[PDB]
Design a protein around this ligand. Structure first.
Ligand SMILES: [Ca+2]
Ligand SMILES: [Ca+2]
Ligand SMILES: [Ca+2]
Ligand SMILES: [Ca+2]
Length: 511
DNA sequence: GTGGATGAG
DNA sequence: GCTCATCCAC
C-alpha cells in the first residue's frame, strides 16, 4: 500500500498501560502452565516431564500429566482404571491435613492404590491441602510481574500479559537486537525510529510502510498460517513478532527457575490469546496474526461456545436464541450480521420480546443488549479487546469438610475439624497479603453445618482481636463458641452425626 | 439471609 | 465429578 494501515496514535497507544489493549496493534499473551498440579508434584519428587505422573485425591485423579495422557488416561478415570492403562503410573497424593492438627503434610508412598493397609490416607479423618499449588503459583506470578508491567492473574495456573510497552520500547529504542549476524534493528528500523523522535507526524497520520529489511525478522513459536500468507506485512506483524521473542524469554525464566512448562497464545486480544494457548500443548507457543484471525476462528475446532464466558448455560441458550448451527456458528454469526453490531441488537430485541422467551430464567439481560451484540460481533471477528483488569478484593473465604461416617459425632469432633479450617484459612490470608501487599484481616466468622438429615444450621458473629493484627487463635475460639451454641440448639433434634461442617470469613478490612 | 446457580474443564 | 468465590431471585 501507499502507507501502513495503522496510525501513529495506535502505535504510541501501546506505551500506555491503561489504553494499550484497545489498540488494534495490541500484543497480548495468555500463558498456561498445563497439568499444573501434576507439574508441582513432578518437580517436588525430583521427576521428569516425560514421567507419567498423576495428582491424586482419594480415588479420583485431579491433574494428569501429558506423559500420562499418552496412555489414554484422563481425569474421568479412577486411579484403578488408570493403572490398567499404565502399570508404571506414578500417582502422587495431595498433601493432607489431619483432623485435629493445624499443619498439612505429604504422605509419599501412601495411597488407596497401594495394597498395604498400613499405608493408607483415610478420607474420614483427613482434608486435602492445596497450599503447595498456591505457593508455587505465587512464585510464577512473581516472575511474571518482574518481566512485565501489566499482568493479569486469570487463574491458579494461567496469566495474561500486556506486552505493549516492551514491544514499543523494543521497536523504537533497542540498539542491541539483531535479525541476522549482519543486521540489527536500529539500522533495520531507522526510518520509523527517526520519524518518531522527530515528532513531525500528526497522531492521526498513517505510519509509513514497513521497510524491506524488517521482513527478515523472526517469529518464535508456531505462526498459524493455513493459507500461507506473508509473515510480516505491516506494523502489527512487527510488534507481534517482537512480542513472541520477549514472550519466549519469560517462559524460559519460568522453566529455568521453577521447572514448569507452559503453553502460550499470542495475539491482539485476550479471547483469541486463550484459544491459542490451548491450540497446542504442552510447551508450545502459537502466534495468531491479525490477518489470520478468521483463518484461526474458522479452522473447524472452534464455536461460539468456545469463548471465555460462553462455555456454559448462557452459550447454549445463545445457540438456541440465535438459531445458530451446531457447526460453524462463528462464521454464521459474521455473515448473518455482516455490517454492524446494531443489526444483532435489533434481532436480539425482538427475540427478547418473543412469546416463548423466558424473562425469568434467561441469562441475557434485556437492559444490557447493547453490550451483548458488540461482544458477539467483535468476538466473531476476533477483535474483542478486553483490558487486563485486576481481580477484585475477596468478600468471602471458606474452608469445609463433607463428613461421612461418624467422623463428626460430638462437639469435640467438630472442634478438631475447626482447627484444620483455621490453619487453612490462615495460610490463605497470608497468600492474599502477598498478592495485595496489604494487610488483610476478617472481622466476621460464620460457622455452618448439615445435620444427619441434611438440615442447615449456622451462626455468624464478630471476631475481635486482642492485638492490632490478626491472630488465628482468635478465630478458633469464636469458631468454638458457635459450634458449642449450635450443639445446644439441636439437642433433641436431628443432628449428629454431621454430614457437612464449614467455616467462612467475611467483612475484611484491607489495610 | 442464603440456597442454588454460575463460570473452567 | 468436582473444586472455588460470587451474585441475586426468592
Ligand atoms: Ca489451565
Ligand atoms: Ca489438636
Ligand atoms: Ca486451569
Ligand atoms: Ca494486514
Amino acid at each position: 500500500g501507499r502507507m501502513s494501515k495503522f496510525t501513529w496514535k495506535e502505535l504510541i497507544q501501546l506505551g500506555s498501560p491503561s489504553k494499550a489493549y484497545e489498540s488494534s496493534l495490541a500484543c497480548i499473551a495468555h500463558i498456561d502452565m498445563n497439568a499444573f498440579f501434576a507439574q508441582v508434584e513432578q518437580m517436588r519428587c525430583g521427576l521428569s516431564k516425560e514421567d507419567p505422573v498423576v495428582c491424586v485425591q482419594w480415588n479420583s485423579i485431579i491433574a494428569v500429566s501429558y506423559a500420562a495422557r499418552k496412555y489414554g488416561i484422563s481425569r474421568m478415570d479412577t486411579i484403578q482404571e488408570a493403572l490398567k492403562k499404565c502399570s508404571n503410573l506414578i500417582p502422587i497424593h495431595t498433601a493432607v491435613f489431619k483432623k485435629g492438627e493445624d499443619f498439612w503434610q505429604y504422605h509419599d508412598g501412601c495411597g488407596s492404590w497401594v495394597q498395604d493397609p498400613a499405608k493408607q490416607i483415610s478420607v474420614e479423618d483427613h482434608k486435602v491441602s492445596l497450599e503447595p499449588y498456591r505457593r508455587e503459583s505465587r512464585k510464577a506470578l512473581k516472575i511474571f510481574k518482574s518481566a512485565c508491567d501489566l499482568v493479569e492473574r486469570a487463574s491458579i495456573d494461567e496469566v495474561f500479559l500486556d506486552l505493549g510497552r516492551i514491544c514499543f520500547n523494543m521497536l523504537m529504542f533497542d540498539n542491541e537486537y539483531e535479525l541476522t549476524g549482519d543486521l540489527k534493528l536500529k539500522d533495520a528500523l531507522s526510518n520509523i525510529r527517526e520519524a518518531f523522535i522527530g515528532g513531525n507526524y500528526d497522531i492521526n497520520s498513517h505510519l509509513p510502510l514497513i521497510p524491506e529489511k524488517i521482513k527478515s525478522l523472526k517469529f518464535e513459536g508456531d505462526v498459524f498460517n493455513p493459507e500461507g500468507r506473508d509473515l510480516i506485512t505491516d506494523w502489527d506483524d512487527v510488534i507481534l513478532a517482537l512480542g513472541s521473542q520477549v514472550c519466549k524469554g519469560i517462559r524460559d525464566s519460568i522453566k529455568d527457575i521453577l521447572g514448569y512448562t507452559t503453553s502460550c497464545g499470542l495475539s491482539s486480544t485476550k479471547n483469541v490469546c486463550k484459544l491459542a494457548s490451548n491450540y497446542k500443548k504442552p510447551d508450545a507457543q502459537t502466534i495468531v496474526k491479525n490477518d489470520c484471525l478468521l483463518d484461526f476462528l474458522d479452522c473447524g475446532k472452534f464455536e461460539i461456545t468456545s469463548f471465555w464466558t460462553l462455555g456454559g448455560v448462557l452459550g447454549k441458550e445463545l445457540i438456541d436464541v440465535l438459531d445458530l448451527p451446531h457447526e460453524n456458528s462463528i462464521k454464521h454469526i459474521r455473515e448473518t450480521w455482516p455490517d454492524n453490531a446494531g443489526q444483532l441488537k435489533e434481532f436480539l430485541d425482538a427475540k427478547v420480546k418473543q412469546s416463548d422467551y423466558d424473562r425469568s430464567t434467561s441469562n441475557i439481560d434485556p437492559l444490557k443488549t447493547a453490550d451483548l451484540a458488540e461482544k458477539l460481533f467483535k468476538l466473531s471477528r476476533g477483535r474483542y479487546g478486553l483490558p487486563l483488569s485486576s481481580r477484585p478484593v475477596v468478600k468471602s473465604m471458606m474452608s469445609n469438610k463433607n463428613l461421612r461416617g461418624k467422623s463428626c459425632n460430638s462437639i469435640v469432633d467438630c472442634i478438631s475439624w475447626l482447627e484444620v479450617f483455621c490453619a487453612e484459612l490462615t495460610s490463605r490470608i497470608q497468600d492474599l497479603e502477598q498478592e495485595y501487599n496489604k494487610i488483610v484481616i476478617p472481622r466476621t466468622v460464620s460457622i455452618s453445618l448439615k445435620t444427619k438429615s441434611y438440615e442447615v444450621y449456622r451462626k455468624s458473629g464478630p471476631v475481635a482481636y486482642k492485638g492490632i493484627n490478626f491472630q488465628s487463635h482468635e478465630l478458633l475460639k469464636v469458631g468454638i463458641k458457635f459450634v458449642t451454641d449450635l450443639d445446644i440448639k439441636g439437642k433433641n433434634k436431628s443432628y449428629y452425626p454431621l454430614t457437612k461442617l464449614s467455616m467462612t470469613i467475611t467483612n475484611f478490612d484491607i489495610i
